[PDB]
Structure formats: C-alpha cells, structure tokens
Amino acid sequence: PITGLVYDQRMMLHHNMWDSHHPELPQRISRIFSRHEELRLLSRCHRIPARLATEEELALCHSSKHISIIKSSEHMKPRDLNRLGDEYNSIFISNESYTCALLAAGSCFNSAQAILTGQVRNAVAIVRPPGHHAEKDTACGFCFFNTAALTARYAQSITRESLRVLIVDWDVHHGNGTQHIFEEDDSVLYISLHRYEDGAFFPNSEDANYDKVGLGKGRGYNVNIPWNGGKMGDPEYMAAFHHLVMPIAREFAPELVLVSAGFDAARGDPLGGFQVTPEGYAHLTHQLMSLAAGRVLIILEGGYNLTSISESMSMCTSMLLGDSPPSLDHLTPLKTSATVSINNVLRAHAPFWSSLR
Numbered sequence: 001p002i003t004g005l006v007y008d009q010r011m012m013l014h015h016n017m018w019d020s021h022h023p024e025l026p027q028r029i030s031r032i033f034s035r036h037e038e039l040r041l042l043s044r045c046h047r048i049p050a051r052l053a054t055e056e057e058l059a060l061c062h063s064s065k066h067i068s069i070i071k072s073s074e075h076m077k078p079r080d081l082n083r084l085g086d087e088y089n090s091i092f093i094s095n096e097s098y099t100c101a102l103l104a105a106g107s108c109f110n111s112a113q114a115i116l117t118g119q120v121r122n123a124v125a126i127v128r129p130p131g132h133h134a135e136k137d138t139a140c141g142f143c144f145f146n147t148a149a150l151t152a153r154y155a156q157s158i159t160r161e162s163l164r165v166l167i168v169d170w171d172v173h174h175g176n177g178t179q180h181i182f183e184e185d186d187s188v189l190y191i192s193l194h195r196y197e198d199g200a201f202f203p204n205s206e207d208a209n210y211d212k213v214g215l216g217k218g219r220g221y222n223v224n225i226p227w228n229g230g231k232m233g234d235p236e237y238m239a240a241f242h243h244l245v246m247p248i249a250r251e252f253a254p255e256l257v258l259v260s261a262g263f264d265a266a267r268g269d270p271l272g273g274f275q276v277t278p279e280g281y282a283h284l285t286h287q288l289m290s291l292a293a294g295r296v297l298i299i300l301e302g303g304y305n306l307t308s309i310s311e312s313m314s315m316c317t318s319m320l321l322g323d324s325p326p327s328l329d330h331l332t333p334l335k336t337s338a339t340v341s342i343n344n345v346l347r348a349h350a351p352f353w354s355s356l357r
C-alpha cells in the first residue's frame, strides 16, 4: 500500500506585496514539507509530480469570465493587481498568483489520477493558494480556483461522470464555494464542519447553517455542521464524525474521498480559535481511511500557525502511511453547544439518511 505526496516550491511565489507578513504566507507549504522531511515521512511516500492545470480543466467548475480575469493578473501592474484584488472579499494578487493556483489544482489532479489508476492508495497535497471559498464566477477568502471542487470533477472526467466523491471539509471556515458548486449535485457529497457563530464568522453567510441540505436532486447531499459559542476541540470533532460524518459517508459509499484539509481549527491558530490537536487530526484521517477502499486525498486549505499546520498535516500523512492512530483522551464530555449543533444536524438530515440516529 503506497501513499502519494505532491509538493512544489513554485507555489511559494504567490505573495502579498503590501503585507509580507499576511498569514496566508508562502512559508506555510515549505514549513509543512520540511516537517515531513524531518519526521522521515517524505521518504516513505511515492513522490507525485506537480503540474499546471489547463484552462479547460478550470472550466469544469469556473466561468470563462472568471478564468480570463485571473489569467490576466499575471501581466498586471501593481496598481491594477491591487484594484482587482479589492474587488473580491479578502483577496491579494501578485503576478505569480495565477500560476500558483494552476499548480495547486494540477497537483491535486495528478494525485487524484495516481489514486484512481492504482499507482497509490491515498495521497497528501501540500499546496497553495487554498481553494474552498472560490466560487464558479468569483474569488474569495485567499482562494482563486476551487481546487477541491475541481479535483472531484476531474476525477469524474477521468473515470465516469457519476463517480461518487465525498468531500470532507474540516477547515474551520465553511467552504461556501464548494457547497455552491455541488448544491444540486447528488454525485458529490459535501460535508463541512465549521465555526459559524450564528453567521457572524467568515464567510459570514447563513448559507453555512445546518438547514442548507442541498437543492433538487442534491437534497441531502450537503451536510453543514456549524459550531456556535464554544472553543471546539478533539472531543467535538470526534463526536461529529461518530454521529454524522461517518454514518452519512458510509451510506453514501463514496469511491473517492477528498479532504479539504484546512488546519486553522488547530490548537494555536489565531484565526480559528479552536483547539483540535495533531492526534485529533490523525484520528479523523484514520476514520476516513475506512471509506472508498482507502482512496483518500488530503488537500491543504487554510491553516495559519506554521508549527501547528506542520505538525497536524504530518500527523495526517503518518496515518495514511499506515501508522497506528495515537492515543487521545478519555471521557471529556463535549461542550454543551456542540451537542446542540450535532443534534440540529441530525434532525435536518434524518429524512435523507435512514441510518442516522
């Protein structure tokens, strides 16, 4: 059983030229990659080459008008990069941004193909800029193109259109772009856990609440798990996986699992304010590996504490390689509010998932 790994230093080139310390830092992926080297995990993995995604592949999810405006930033003067970025919600653009976003997407494509043709069982994608806030027609929250949403359609395009793909989004933020792209779609199951605070948390939309369950044929195939009033940690994430994520996923029987793996719910992240530990991420990964004959691709999204994301993603890779899941804790009743969120999700999805309890 082989674990794949994709990483390309050129993705570092994307940067914020008006705040060189912006938390979506080039060094996020180099610090994660370096930690993989030091922990002797990188040598255990099959190295998958990065590549540029093509514009045709971007068209699997994005409008040609959005593609063309982002492609055009590669030749913009600083003044126009600044105006263009300011047209979006929380976006900065450099001249290298388009190429880096193409590389993060093509990297994940090659990983998905490696998994789907049998070259590897599972894989990990150390990529940037992130993807999950990007919409069909717009960029948002440090994301230009929806890497995870593209990878699901890419996977379908190289197999069959109805390939069952589960996307688990454990980034602390709701993946509004991923929800919206597949909202009518019953071939892609989207499950997001996210800090919500009654809609007061980025992306600041009631679209992230538990009562958005999908539209049309897609009703039931959009599972939002919103967290309210509480510094959620391992016990809460493990409880959501037990009562919602794994039961629903198993009933869906995916053939591929994409993890939109933001690490901004990690202990130490100032944007997230949550406290999931590395061993917590390790346990979530291990539960996901019981699906889809192990076809699990972990994709870096958010995560802004360099040490935290490097330890946490390393933990996930260690699990993919087959290392034993590490010990966590005992008892530790959930935070009150987390039982409330979980129960609310259970009720809204009972009509769609008959194995829910």
Ligand SMILES: CC1(C)c2ccccc2N(Cc2ccc(C(=O)NO)cc2)[C@@H]1c1cccnc1
Pocket (backbone or CB within 6 Å): 090, 130, 133, 140, 141, 142, 171, 173, 201, 202, 204, 262, 264, 271, 301, 302, 303
């Ligand atoms: C906290 C906040 C004030 C902020 C300060 C400094 C820079 C950015 C941002 N935000 C946007 C944001 C944050 C994280 C991610 C992500 O992808 N994490 O993984 C994507 C977008 C917040 C915001 C902006 C407008 C309205 N409400 C919240």
Ligand SMILES: [K+]
Pocket (backbone or CB within 6 Å): 169, 170, 171, 172, 173, 174, 175, 192, 193, 194
């Ligand atoms: K999420």
Ligand SMILES: [K+]
Pocket (backbone or CB within 6 Å): 182, 183, 184, 185, 186, 188, 189, 190, 214, 218, 221, 222
């Ligand atoms: K869906």
Ligand SMILES: [Zn+2]
Pocket (backbone or CB within 6 Å): 171, 172, 173, 262, 264, 301, 302, 303
């Ligand atoms: Zn995030």
